[PDB]
Amino acid sequence: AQYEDGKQYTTLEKPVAGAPQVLEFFSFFCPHCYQFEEVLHISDNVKKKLPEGVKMTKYHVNFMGGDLGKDLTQAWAVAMALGVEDKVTVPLFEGVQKTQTIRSASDIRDVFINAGIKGEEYDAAWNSFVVKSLVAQQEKAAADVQLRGVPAMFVNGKYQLNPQGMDTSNMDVFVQQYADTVKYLSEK
Secondary structure (H helix, E strand, O other): OOOOEOOOEEEOOOOOOOOOOEEEEEOOOOHHHHHHHHOOOHHHHHHOOOOOOOOEEEEEOOOOOHHHHHHHHHHHHHHHHHOOHHHHHHHHHHHHHHOOOOOOHHHHHHHHHHOOOOHHHHHHHHHOHHHHHHHHHHHHHHHHOOOOOOOEEEEOOOEEEOHHHOOOOOHHHHHHHHHHHHHHHHHO
16 A cells, blocks of 8 residues: 555554544654754644644653653643743744753743743743643653654554654655645544
């Protein structure tokens, strides 16, 4: 076939019931994740090809960057709760990997402040039980799928994208193949 298990995707031998339709995992410490966000705009190009009626979910993971990794997962929960993902994603990536100005929870906080979220508003979210359960959800979804590597994308709790098995000679072509694969898996 043109799309084959173990080629553009792999199949989970242990499917995850009730899982989000399109589920993406990343880390602000993750170099390919930086590329995926800044250079390739994977999430976006996938959205552009997904059928409509499909929801897209993106979660942060703990297993990179130790204590700051966990802080970053709580901060992403804050970003999700306040709906400011699209204002903090880029400065977080660049603060961790490009300028290396993020070293503590306080520096993460500064990124939100500079993006215009209010101190009060951030610290309340940060400390809220709604954010605790949002952190819980991120961890649970990672736990549900055996996750030891990022970036990662899962479709309907049963298929996992496999970018190693796509051409990388051209970045535009890689993305399109990636997105088309998601659409195909979506329709499966």
